[PDB]
Design a protein around this nucleic acid. Structure first.
Lengths: 664, 83, 264, 53
DNA sequence: GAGGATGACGATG
DNA sequence: CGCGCATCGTCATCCTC
DNA sequence: GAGGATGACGATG
């Protein structure tokens, strides 16, 4: 009674986001006041997610499995007018009046019995129960896989009216969906290495041509309109900005072109302007990375009866090894550094040959720093320093994760003045930083330089960086998570998954060329028959024309046949034989068609002659030519970024060999 | 004219075809003329006389065109008659 | 980096000219003189004068007031009050032209439409003003408008609290109305001459509606030198008045009317 | 205090006012004017008829 | 009973 | 992603010595 | 000299 309130009612949407807020609130309350979980202190308010209406008849549905059961149990499909309720802006005051007209349906309390539930309350909030959560997610994934294989429908809540709600089912049924969704959206798969947001953006970009430039804010709305994006607008724009970043230490191959200020390498890289201030344009590499002919390979999802993006893609190279996968999710995580793009082609060629591929080293574009690996899955990265004189010194190259403002505030300020425990190390410093390169006119006492050398230049200035790669967990082609050991095994798995598709593409291409080939052959035969002359065009009925076309061995539309054999794999159709203008009756058109019909025959004979092998190399040849062109453009940009200043002076430089602490 | 039959379609060069189209009183594209007389207000064009599919050679298409050509004449006469 | 120059107290009068509540007629004469000079220069084809042609060390206040701020005054006056021919402001004009560019059979988002309008109409006034203009075009409740060009989809603000309590432009949806097809027939596209900016076909300077919009939705414009405030009227009487005028008789006096309003 | 009670049963478009008042004060309100006391009158003038030709 | 003071306002910064 | 100060000018109230 | 405490982080609320 002393408290200002007696009951706490929280309300969220039917999405999984509210589950996290409810869990955090339960944690905040139970952490200090467990005894208040038995006096009707907490309750819940719920909202609808979808409503059907036909002939002034409405039905309420609060669960997606409930909607699936309603579809499986009712013979009316498309008969009911459906209306989705993703957010709060859709509902109106007239609906709120009906919502508050029935309290016993939405206002539901909770129930607590036995201390065992508290363990579950701690399960999602204990830093010492990581393996327990791992087993929990594994059990749920196995159960979902088994239920999907057996085709048995899963269980859901809010089927009928309820007065209370047990915590055990609350944790085991609702928050687990948020955990699964966060894990699915946080870490990309191993097949394409693209997150769902990047996937939606790239699919929307593929939908159009975009010959000219386009705004980011304008593109975000178009992406959200077709990709069914329901996560606000800021996250999508942030993902687009991350895709746009291509500076040193961020990415190695982007899908866009840098137009505007996308954040510099000086202050965090997050100092970019508004998405409407900046412009963007699609790159030329995406055309070769994802060939259009692969659209008939994967099966798209069916949401809102709309053709949407697929679940993954089939790139020519694993993107995780070129741009890095930094994902943080529940149960596991993923952090893979970058590598060299040139070595990937040589490794793939060696694997196609059948030889053991050479070990790779983490590389970065525009980075001259050497990396030595002493222990497996561990790397040491150091920069380069130049000693011009016994007093002056300059840092030539900085290691990865080195920002100008942070490095300055964390190194120069303690070294310049005398701190509480350390004397002033440096005497002077200058920052002549360019757009990409750095300059340090730093002076130091000659006597202190000997001590700095004895201790270590990389050690005193903190130029060494250690990283370990152990979380090699990625989504498999099936959907499972497996902790990997080496990169070469991932390359071999990708190679097998890619080899599986050469035959599929060959089967799709074979016969499809034959269809247009037979179509052109029939058209040429019709032209030759007209030159000879048997079909009278004197106002003859279409029925006699179709009868003659059937009696003279003319097939129907092959394109219609290939279209019919796509969803699951009157009478005849002859529109294509009558939709031809009179230009076909000219000598030049006939002469060019006589060889156009054989231009396809040449490729068809080549496909019948070629093997599934020797195609990957021919596909990579154009890609290597385009990559050399892109590198030439990058060198041209460097020439643009050339002010006219003198080259860096040659000077003594050394790399420290840290003792190996034998970690892990 | 095709029903009567004088223009041979046996791989004749386009030059002879254009010469025949000029000699038989066939004008150029009127849409091109109205487009030209819009900004400030090779030789002849006959693409529209050759971009027609074979469906025009059917009885039903000819019968419907015979009245479609007069559907516009009715509105043209009405415009010439109305104020 | 250019400094300024001050000579003589007379410039202070100009400094007060654009900032005196007792010199309204003086500003009116000033705008009138500028408009007459611009009309004469355009008719004679003589090029006007401009500043910053060569390097300058100082800048006199008299020319500063008479040459630079006057352009802002003219632009604000041109963009604030609509014309008498169509009664549409330049923002509404750009939005309606962009809407005419497409068909829009289904619904569309407001925030998504604003970018498409800004992309083709050469809009350079941020994004908030365009969305606010779209919201004002969307309002159709009692006491606001009598005939809109859109359809009410969502919460466009109620008649209880200011009418400005609407949600985010992305929260709400919109759809083109069916009356616009009859108000602006497509065949009128060959009548007006469009401007040529960026070598691109853009919206015209005005439109030719079947009825004066100022008498159906009101023109509330506040600009420099003058303003405009016209109340609403009845739509049924407009047709009778136009028929009587086509006949050649003296039209009857009208009375300000409002949709769903029984007040005399 | 002029009024004694009031209620606001407002719909989406229409309004409702269950308002009570002293019968004696109603006579004074009538003598003064219902539109005047409750401020229901609104005056507007249209003089700025300036438009772009 | 009249004049200075207070908001109504609609596109833009 | 909601939070908030103003401009140009015109006019309806409105209240006190 | 080792273990708890402090930030690095990337999509979303």
């Amino acid at each position: 009674k002393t408290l200002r309130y007696g009951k706490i009612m929280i309300m969220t949407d039917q999405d999984q986001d509210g589950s996290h807020i409810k869990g955090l609130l339960i944690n905040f309350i139970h952490h200090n006041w467990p005894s208040l979980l038995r006096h009707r202190f907490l309750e819940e308010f719920i909202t609808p997610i979808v409503k059907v209406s036909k002939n002034k008849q409405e039905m309420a549905f609060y669960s997606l499995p409930e909607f699936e059961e309603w579809k499986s149990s009712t013979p009316n499909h498309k008969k009911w007018k459906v209306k989705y309720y993703k957010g709060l802006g859709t509902s109106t005051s007239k609906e709120a009046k009906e919502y508050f007209a029935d309290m016993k349906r939405h206002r539901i309390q909770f129930k607590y019995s036995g201390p065992e539930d508290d363990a579950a309350i701690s399960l999602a909030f204990s830093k010492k129960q990581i393996d327990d959560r791992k087993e929990w997610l594994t059990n749920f994934m196995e159960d979902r896989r088994q239920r999907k294989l057996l085709g048995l429908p899963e269980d859901y809540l809010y089927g009928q009216t309820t007065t209370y709600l047990t915590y055990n089912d609350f944790i085991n049924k609702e928050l687990i969906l948020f955990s699964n969704s966060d894990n699915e959206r946080s870490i990309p798969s191993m097949v394409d290495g693209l997150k769902p947001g990047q996937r939606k953006v790239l699919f929307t970009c593929f939908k159009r041509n975009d010959k000219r430039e386009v705004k980011v804010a304008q593109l975000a709305g178009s992406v959200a309109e077709m990709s069914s994006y329901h996560h606000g607008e800021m996250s999508l724009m942030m993902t687009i900005i991350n895709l746009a970043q291509n500076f040193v230490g961020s990415n190695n191959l982007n899908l866009l072109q840098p137009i505007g200020q996308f954040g510099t390498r000086l202050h965090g890289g997050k100092d970019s302007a508004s998405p409407r201030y900046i412009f963007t344009m699609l790159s030329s590499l995406a055309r070769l990375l994802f060939p259009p002919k692969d659209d008939h390979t994967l099966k798209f999802l069916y949401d809102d009866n709309q053709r949407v993006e697929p679940e993954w893609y089939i790139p020519i190279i694993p993107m995780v090894l070129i741009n890095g996968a930094e994902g943080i999710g529940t149960g596991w995580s993923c952090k893979i550094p970058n590598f060299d793009v040139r070595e990937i082609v040589n490794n793939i060629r060696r694997l196609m040959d059948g030889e053991e591929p050479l070990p790779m080293l983490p590389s970065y574009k525009n980075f001259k720093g050497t990396i030595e690996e002493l222990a497996p899955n561990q790397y040491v990265i150091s920069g380069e320093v130049a000693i011009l004189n016994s007093t002056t010194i300059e840092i030539s190259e900085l290691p990865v994760r080195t920002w100008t403002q942070t490095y300055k505030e964390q190194v120069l300020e303690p070294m310049l003045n005398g701190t509480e425990k350390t004397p002033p190390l440096i005497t002077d410093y200058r920052e002549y930083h360019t757009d990409t390169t750095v300059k340090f006119v730093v002076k130091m006492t000659e006597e202190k330089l000997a001590e700095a050398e004895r201790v270590g230049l990389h050690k005193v200035f903190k130029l060494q960086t250690s990283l370990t790669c152990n979380s090699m967990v990625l989504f498999d082609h099936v959907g499972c998570l497996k902790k990997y050991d080496t990169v070469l095994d991932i390359l071999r798995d990708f190679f097998e998954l890619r080899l599986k598709y050469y035959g599929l593409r060959k089967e799709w291409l074979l016969g499809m060329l034959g269809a247009e080939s037979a179509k052109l052959n029939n058209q040429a035969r019709f032209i030759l028959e007209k030159i000879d002359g048997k079909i009278i065009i004197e106002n003859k009925p279409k029925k006699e024309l179709i009868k003659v076309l059937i009696q003279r061995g003319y097939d129907s539309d092959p394109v219609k046949a290939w279209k019919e054999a796509q969803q699951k794999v009157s009478g005849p159709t002859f529109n294509y034989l009558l939709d031809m203008p009179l230009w076909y009756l000219t000598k030049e058109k006939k002469d060019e068609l006589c060889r156009l019909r054989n231009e396809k025959e040449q490729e068809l004979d080549t496909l019948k002659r070629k093997s599934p092998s020797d195609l990957w190399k021919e596909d990579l040849a154009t890609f290597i030519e385009e990559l050399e062109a892109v590198e030439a453009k990058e060198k041209q940009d460097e020439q643009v970024g050339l002010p006219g200043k003198g080259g860096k002076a040659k000077g003594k430089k050394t790399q420290m060999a840290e003792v190996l602490p034998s970690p892990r």
